[PDB]
Every structure is written in C-alpha cells, then in structure tokens.
C-alpha cells in the first residue's frame, strides 16, 4: 500500500483498457469457433454470428441423431467418439509407460549420487531437448520392417504410436527431478539411520511423497499424447483406427469444407482445455 | 541388427550384485533403457538411412530374390550403402540446393521473429499482471492462458478455417470493415505473415508463464528502493526488471528458437503446401520449414519417396546440436 | 528534520497493528524502536518512510503535513532488512542510482560518490558488483547509497541483523560515528536491548503496536513504566514476586512477602492511588540482588540450577512458596552446588511495584546517570 | 558407549577439512563442539554417525572398532538440522519408524511412544502429521524419535542457525532436561559459546579441522591453552598487550608494558621455554581489570567509547602506544564522558602470557571453580 501519485489511476485505466482490448483480440478466434458451431450452414457466409440455434452439427458430432433437414437423412460425417476412444487408449498407455519409466531415473538423477552423474545429466539435457526431428522416417522404416515380425507394434497399429510416445520420459524426468530436489535431502539419511535399506528408503519414504508430481506428470503427458498429431497422422491409415487430431484434418477438405461439424467437434474437445486450465496448472503460485 | 541392439540394451552387464555403482544405475537403467530404445535409436537409424539409397525403388531390403546375372548389380540390389552420395547431392545438385537455402533462410527468419515477438508480449503481460494494484488478476491470468489450454491442433485448424479464401470469415470481416482481400494462402508474404501471427498466438502464454515465474524470483526491495529514489514504472522496467531477466532468459530464448525452428506440426497443419517454388525437382513451398521439406521428400507421393535424401540428418540435427551446446553452456552460467 | 507522529493508526482491515501512537523526535536525535518479533516496528518505519499508507492520523517531517506525499518527495532515506542492492549494477551505480535518475551532472554524481566512498572506505571496491562483496562491504555500500541520497531523516530497518557478532559490533560503532559526525535525525529498529541501550538517545518500546514507554536508555532501565517494559529491558528476565499491600504512607508502601516469613518492608514509591489490601507485584532485577550477610530482608531458597558462565554465576533459586524460580546473578564464579539451601537479600531501595492493570509506581530512589544529558 | 576418536583424519577430496583429531569421550558425558566453521563440526559429527567415510584413523563406539560398520548398527541416534521429518507419516509413525522396520510387534511400538510422549509432553498430538506442527513440537517429535530408538550415544546438530530466540531457549531447556533425565553419552554441536558454557561436561574447541583444547568450560575460561581458544571463550575479546621479557624466574616471568613508563610486572606463569629479550603478547580479561586506585599497575589512557548497559559499562580506553582500545567492564554504572582520560588497574594474577607462536604458558595461580 505504497503512497502513490495521481498518475496511478491513469496508469490503471490505461492498463485495464489495454488488457481488455488484448483479451478481445485473443478470444476472437475461440468466440468465432463457438458461434460457428451454432450456425445452421456448414459453409459459413450469411450472418457472422447467427441468432438461430440449430444444434444440428452438435448432434451430428455427437452421433445422437442424423438431424433430418430435408427428406434425405444425413448420416454422421465421422465417428468422433471413436476418435476420442482411440486417443484415450493411446494417451493412457503412453502416460502409464512414461511415469513408470521416468520415476526411477528421476530418483537416480536427483537424490542419490554416482560418478557419471554430470555426464548423464548433460546427455539427458542433450537428448531431451531434441524434438521429433526426422525420426519419423526411421520410425516408418522400422515399423515397416517390424510389422511382419510382431504385428501388434508394427504399422497401422497403436503399438507404433505408443512406442513413439514413450520418448517423453526425457521431458518428464526433469519435472520429477525438480520435485525430488524440492523434497528435503535428509530423509534418506535418516531412514538409513533407522535401519532402512536404500530400496526401502525409496519405496516407503520418498515414493509416497512423489504421488502429487506423478499425478501431475500423468495428466501432462496424457494431454500431450491426446493432442499429438505428427506420428499418429503419419502411421495411422485405416479409417476406423484414427485417433484424435487426425480426423480433424478430414473435417476440412477442399471437396467438402465443414465448418459446423468441425466446430461442433472442436467444442466437444473442450474437456482437455479445462483439464489443462486447472489440473495441469495445479494452482501453483505462478 | 535389432536383436543385437536389444541384447546390448539388456546385457549392458552393469547389474552385478556388488552394491557398487551398479546399485545406483539399477535405478537409472529403467528409463535410460527407454530413452536408448525410443529416442536415440530412431536418431541413429536416421543417421544410417542417409548413407543408404532407401527409396520407393529400394524400400525392400533383400526379400525380392525371384519376385543368369539376375540384375545382381548395385541399383537392383535395392538397399545398398552409397556413402556421402546423398550428403553431396543436397549441395552439388543445385536443383535442390537453392530451395534448401531458401527454406533455411525462411525458417531462421520465422523462428527469430516469432521468438522476439513472443518474448516481448509475454514479458509485458507478466509485468502488467504482477502489478499487485490490478483487479481480477486470476481472471486475467486464466483468459491470457486460454490459448495454452486449448489443444494446439484445434487452434491451428481453427485459424486455417478463419483465414480461408474460398469462403472465409476473417477476410469478409475485413471486407465489411474496409474492402480488402488479403489472400493469405495465395500470396507467400501474407502466408508468412499469418504464419507469424498464429505462431505468436500459440506461443505467447508459455513465455508469459516463464516471465511470471522470473518476476516472482525477482525481489521487491529493489522496486521499493527505486520508488524511494523516484523511479517510475517504465524506468523500473527498463533499468531493474529487464537487466535481471535477459540473463536467465537467454537459454529460454534459445530453446524457444529451436522449438520454432522445428515447428513441423504447425507448418504441416496450416498451409502445408504454401505456394510451391515453381521449378523444384523435389516438392517445396515458400512457407516450408526444413522438417516439412524433408517430410515432403519422404512421404508425399509427388516427391518420389526418396528416403535417402529425406534423411538430411547432418544439416538439421547438426544445427540442432550446435543449439544444444549453446544452451548447455548458458545453463552452467551463474 | 524533526519527525513527529500524532494519533497515527494503521488498520490492515480488521486488525489494527498500531493504534494512536505519539512520538516527538527532535532534530538530530537517535531514536530506536524496540519490541517483540511483531512487525509493528517495521511497519511503523515503513509508514514513516511512506512505503505504507497511514490509515489515520498525521505525520510531520519538519513543518508540513506529509501523510499523502510520495516517498520521492519525502526527503527520507531508508536501508532495508535485506540490503536491497541491485545485483546487475556495480557499487558506484548502486549508490548513484537516485542521482542518475534525478540529476544529469555526471561531475556532481562522481564527486558525491567519491566523497562518500572516502568517508565510508569504499574506494578500492567501487568497481565491483554486490555479489562479490562480503556482508560488511554490502552494508557499508547500502549506507553509502543512503548518504549519497543525503536525506533529512535516516531510516535503518534492522541493519545489524545479517551479520555475526564481531562485525555487527564494529558496524554498531561505525553507526555511532556516523551519528556523531552527521548529526542528522536517524531512526533505528532492532530487537536487541544491547544495541538499543548502546546506540539510542531515545528508546521507544512498542507493545502490539502501542507505545509502552519512551525515554533515555538508562531511564527505561531504572524507571520502567510498566510490567512489559520492566521485563523487556534487561538481558536476564526481571524477577517478579506477588505482594500484598498492608499500609500506605505518604511516600512509601508496605508489602507482605507471600512466604511463611510474613515479613513487612517499606518500599519508596509514589504511593499515589494505591489501595490497601490489594494484590500487588514486586519486581527486582537479578543484578541488584544483595548477598545474605549484608541484607536485613532475607529470601531463603533452594538451589535448582547453577549456571557458571565464568565471568558471572547465574543461580536459579526456588523459594518454598513463590511459583516462579528466583534468578540470582553474581560477579565472578560462585561455588554453590545444586540442591543446596541459599539465602539472598532484597534491597528495599531497588524494588518495583506493578498494579493489576500492569502499570508501575515510580520509585523515589535517585539513580546515577539518569541526568547525564 | 564411550566414543574414542583416535587419529581420525578427514580428506574431502584433496582439501583436509579435519586434521588428526584425537578425542576421548567417556560414558555418560555431554560433549559440545563449538567452532567458527560450521561444516567441519557437522562433518565430524557425520563421520561419528556413519553417514560419512573416514579417510584415516579408527573410531571406537564403546569398546568395539566401528570405522566400517554401517550406520544402522552403530548404535547412534542423530538429530538433523531439519529433523528429517517424514511429512506423509504421522507423528507416531515418525517416532517409531525404527521399531516398525524390524519387529513392530504392535506392543512395544506403542508402549515406547506413549512413554516418550509422556516424558516429552507430546501425547496429546501424537496422531497428527508434521505439517500441522509448530517448531517446538517438530523438534520434540525428532527428539522423541531418537528416544524411541534408544541409542548408546546421542548426536545433535546445530539447528539454532535456522531457529529463533524463543525456540532456541525451548531447545536448550528440553535438551538440559533430557541430559539430566537420562545421563547417557551425548554429543552436541554449536557455534555459540554461551550455549557450550551453560551446558557441557567437556568442550572441544575446533579450529581449521584441528582440535585446539579439550576440557571443562571453566577450565577453558581460566586456563586457555592458546590464543584462538583464549579469544573464543568470552563475549568481550580479551585485551591483548604485546610485551617484552626482561628476566625469567623458575615460577614467574617479568615482562615490559608498551606504556611509556616501561613498567615491569612479575606475573606468575609456567615460566618454561622462555628466552629473555623475546617478544610475546599479554592478555587480561575485560572483567578482571581492576580499578586504578586499588591496583599498583595503572593503565592511563583516553576514553573512546562508554557503553552504559545498566548492569555494566563497557569503557573502551585507547591506551597510548597501544593500538587496541582495552575493554573495561565494571558493575553498576560509572559516569565517564567520551574523550576524557580514565585510569584502570592491571592485576598480575589474571594476566595470561602467550608465546610468540600462540601457545599459552600454564598459569600457576590457582583459581576457584576449576577443580
């Protein structure tokens, strides 16, 4: 509550005006995709924000009904719920694998010590901030050669998807190691004093203390898996096997552009938005 | 080869029950094996593919035996090791070198511009949000973060629809306000401009979060002393906050530069085929990053599916490893 | 110049940290603010500097009323609990930030920086940054920045808190030298009675954001206003014993020791508004306790804990009847074993009386050094 | 349970953070480690506990070699600075983890915790978690955990660095009650000399990784072995006066005062290995400095600082031809104006003569309280 001059009110008014204008500019695309979802037509034009509430696209995207408009019935365009189910399966398996593979590495890198720690951490950073840069060609060739041997991880299967998705361990090991550093460093020493073998010291003392960060990592990697596009698009070909973010492309196609159905699906994908808004943000002091 | 690699990964041999450094690595191996199999292995394979002639005519390894001399030469041998032939052909060809240099320059310009714009917008938003004299700061944080919460592909495809030309939403809004047709997809310059706008819109909230954290790390006594001396808001921002933010922000700027360099998902989802260079042996567009150039050579049907050229490992991953070394040097700083 | 506070009240919403305090700091006076760990003292220094809004009342620096003047125009310099040194700026830029912000004559800026460096011994370390300096160097740099700003009132927010004993003593003497040379008004906040008593020309004891008593250090030590002041001033806690009033004279009050002795003793106090047959509270510092041989009034007790600090012996005495253990302190080493019956004396001149409301009656025993200045 | 550190040397990489420490702590002694460098004392305590490796030398817990014994079997109980409290476990679980690991039996695990909670005033909150605790309560849980463990020796760190004044007082009280109640071997670490003086049966002054002196607190005060310990013990640093020896007897040494009058004092001293004409340093405590009228040897100088503390006044006198302002303490209050001239006396019996190297000659004068 510092005593401040009369210029403070002017600064506050200017800041409020600028922030309101900026938020309007930012929310224009989202409000426009919301309004388009309620538009009757799928080719847009007409009125920018129609007052009518058709809801036909939502029911098409839900698949609840065919939404008879004229004599001819309109079958659902694409199985969005099937997209969601495949995406959920892939994301769940990928998140479980990421957590299981990353927790022990985070422990080793953060709490205990070993001679090769500096080189291992440097290599961890080095191979962590790689993206999926040209690895797609190698993955495609490898899955082509492997599908004849073991089909369940070969091509046009979820096995290749999950195998490509398990790389996120390099990214998540840093978050879990940061949490491990946050936890007090005398806990393992005290546990060893009471007679705990270091494996028990991890399992009984520090592992139950990792539940919040493990849940946060699970949610973050689940979202990153649900919203992935490159690998799934490249090696997913069968129409029934498509995950999310890959049929969305088929929604917008030059032979048939579909605003209403695409927007209905996009606002049906509102749940990841809220999840990342609240659980991923974890209401940490920003 | 895969069996030998897996056997190496399994019997690394450092699991000897001796309570030595073996124990420590017994914790690291789970996940270290995961990386060695799921991250390093594709990279090494991409390295191996470059030295070969893997293509739509040589995709098969050896299975075609019958399907005399029986074309037992080199090219009918399908998968063969050429050796630096694909590396030389990216330069000496001059049919793919010029497009390569053009998209390289465009990628560098795009990444630098988007990094600077993103850093500036995020830093300004963070400084304004942490005023402690505002109202509804939580609401403002939520609203300014919403682009981060919305899944990326959804926003990219929404922008693809909005910036459409055949029917269009933003275009006819602009026509109603003052009649002009920007022609985003047709004109390469407008395509790059829309591309920069979309990348900034996607990327600003992350740097806003990072700057908000760094302002939290910044103490308040310096601000109080400046206020005692008589400094105003802008003087405070330019002589207190900014000098103490660029020093811990340079590695973040470099990492964002790398990410915007390899933004395959964005450049592939939005205007994947921005107006083609019109005279390229391999397909290539003006709004093409290096990653999607290689993707076009790899899997797009018109590119001939030349996997050997599609590697381009020693260019992309080598500038990327230079970036790794630079950020690693900056991380050990102070 | 002269800082004056009239009915200053601060309200953090429901809670009122400080209420209707009154101070009159004349020009040049070294005044320290002491109290428990409550942030009332720090918040008081902050509202004086202008960093916190004064909810109600008035604050006068010199003549003009300054309740709603920004700290830039206040002519007040402050050092904080943390040293508030900008890490990026060098030492010279750290001390000359304000001059750079306000004026533009680099000749004047460097002249003042060099002068303050020579008088604060900061010349050879002028080009360095705050990280490489030690604690004493950083504190001297902050003091040099304040002297560069050259305010009418100097504010110190616990400067001797982040240093060890030797360095804090040396910089205490340095602060005393600064006060002696400049002579400008300086306001101090600390928790340590030692620093307060060594430095201050006036001490203001704060109790939950209330002015318990204001006066000279020896004045507080000899004539506390109430129980809180008596307990706070003095490194060993002042011994407190209940007493019953039996008869009140014109200038002395009799009390009964709550012990099977049933002894009555006259104590020279104000004896004003004292009610006969009233529960009272007798207090006496451990230092002033007299040995048994040369004292008529005797407190016989059993030794509980004997602490041999070496330069003085602290003997905890349990009296058969009073709840709290009597604390005794004697010069040099006293060889008494635990579990031994001990006798000590109560000098009737050096006693204090505190009523049920907590207020104290002023003693009539004139004390040396009270009128030193 | 008598730890017998012998010729133990610590080599953290290449820098020797501890020289050849040679201590001997008998059964049921409360030994305090006081020093200016916090790492070395804590490092030595950790090597005692087993959490750290000993480079050379042998450690003896009780009457068995314990250099390579793992920490669990050392029979020691350590109280960390952060108390190493497990947040997810409750207070009782924290207190009885050691018993839970091996044979909880669901009888002793509760009987012990109940007894230690009653004798530690913790039973009313034994089922809470460390998050819902105060500082004193958390320290009490750590102490009760150690008591449930029942170690042969009790190792306590120096967490007063992070503590407040009231919590330090509570700590000191309860550790005193602990030591008096049990009477088992205990080691304590501190950097404050007052704490060691109020609670110690044997004090180890540790400097630069080398043990300076080992003895009782009054022994360290009255007969300091060297300059470092002599300065360390006593809040007002002992006034040091360089001196020149005139003659040496078999029981006393006569030195020369920098004072112009060049006075010679036949101070009692060990008077062993002292050569005439050499230069040494003479030390007299601020408390022992007599008033000028009583003592024959008077130190006249100009007063610089008069610090009236009520019970005592720290008169700083800048003696001519001597750089140091000699601190002089007197009971009650003395009205002395700054800048004036005040004279003080020097009692010969309280002068601690110090060799040029730093070793102090033994004072032949008997002193009460040293036993």
From Swiss-Prot, chain A:
UniProt keyword list: Cell inner membrane, Cell membrane, Membrane, Sugar transport, Transmembrane, Transmembrane helix, Transport
Topology, Periplasmic side: 35-87, 143-151, 227-256
Subcellular localization, as worded in the UniProt entry: Cell inner membrane
Location, primary (coarse class): membrane
GO MF entry, a single one: ABC-type maltose transporter activity
Any one biological process term the GO annotation gives: maltodextrin transmembrane transport
One Gene Ontology CC term in the entry: plasma membrane
Domain ABC transmembrane type-1: start-end pairs: 84-280
Function as written in the Swiss-Prot or TrEMBL entry: Part of the ABC transporter complex MalEFGK involved in maltose/maltodextrin import. Probably responsible for the translocation of the substrate across the membrane.
Family (UniProt): Belongs to the binding-protein-dependent transport system permease family. MalFG subfamily.
PANTHER family: MALTOSE TRANSPORT SYSTEM PERMEASE-RELATED (PTHR32243), MALTOSE_MALTODEXTRIN TRANSPORT SYSTEM PERMEASE PROTEIN MALG (PTHR32243:SF50)
Subunit composition and interactions: The complex is composed of two ATP-binding proteins (MalK), two transmembrane proteins (MalG and MalF) and a solute-binding protein (MalE).
Protein name (database record): Maltose/maltodextrin transport system permease protein MalG
Lineage: Bacteria, Pseudomonadati, Pseudomonadota, Gammaproteobacteria, Enterobacterales
GN (gene name): malG
UniProtKB/Swiss-Prot annotation, chain B:
Gene3D superfamilies in UniProt: D-maltodextrin-binding protein, MBP, MalF N-terminal region-like, MetI-like
Cytoplasmic face of the membrane: 18-29, 130-141, 216-235, 330-334
Positions of the ABC transmembrane type-1 domain: 104-328
SUPFAM superfamilies (alphabetical): MalF N-terminal region-like, MetI-like
TM helices/strands, residue ranges: 1-17, 30-52, 107-129, 142-164, 193-215, 236-258, 307-329
Protein name: Maltose/maltodextrin transport system permease protein MalF
UniProt KW Secreted keyword: no
GO biological process terms on file: maltodextrin transmembrane transport
Phylogenetic lineage: Bacteria, Pseudomonadati, Pseudomonadota, Gammaproteobacteria, Enterobacterales
Keyword flag DNA-binding: no
Keyword vocabulary terms for this entry: Cell inner membrane, Cell membrane, Membrane, Sugar transport, Transmembrane, Transmembrane helix, Transport
Pfam families named among the record's database cross-references: BPD_transp_1 (PF00528), MalF_N_TM (PF20872), MalF_P2 (PF14785)
Molecular function per GO: ABC-type maltose transporter activity
Membrane association type: Multi-pass membrane protein
Oligomeric form and interacting partners: The complex is composed of two ATP-binding proteins (MalK), two transmembrane proteins (MalG and MalF) and a solute-binding protein (MalE).
Periplasmic side, ranges: 165-192, 259-306
From Swiss-Prot, chain C:
Binding positions for ATP per the UniProt entry: 35-42
Domain of life of the source: Bacteria
GO cellular component: ATP-binding cassette (ABC) transporter complex, substrate-binding subunit-containing; maltose transport complex
Keyword ATP-binding part of the UniProt annotation: yes
GO MF term list: ABC-type maltose transporter activity; ATP binding; ATP hydrolysis activity
Gene3D superfamilies: 2.40.50.100, Nucleic acid-binding proteins (2.40.50.140), P-loop containing nucleotide triphosphate hydrolases (3.40.50.300)
Coiled coil feature spans: none
EC number: 7.5.2.1
Keywords, alphabetical: ATP-binding, Cell inner membrane, Cell membrane, Membrane, Nucleotide-binding, Sugar transport, Translocase, Transport
Membrane topology of this protein: Peripheral membrane protein
Domain ABC transporter, first and last residues per copy: 3-233
Catalytically driven reaction(s): D-maltose(out) + ATP + H2O = D-maltose(in) + ADP + phosphate + H(+)
Root EC class: translocase
SUPFAM superfamilies (alphabetical): MOP-like, P-loop containing nucleoside triphosphate hydrolases
Keyword Transmembrane set for record: no
Signal peptide (from-to): none
Pfam family, one: TOBE_2
Subcellular location: Cell inner membrane
Subunit structure: The complex is composed of two ATP-binding proteins (MalK), two transmembrane proteins (MalG and MalK) and a solute-binding protein (MalE).
Role this protein plays: Part of the ABC transporter complex MalEFGK involved in maltose/maltodextrin import. Responsible for energy coupling to the transport system.
Family: Belongs to the ABC transporter superfamily. Maltooligosaccharide importer (TC 3.A.1.1.1) family.
Name listed for the protein in its UniProt record: Maltose/maltodextrin import ATP-binding protein MalK
Taxonomic source organism: Escherichia coli O157:H7
Gene: malK
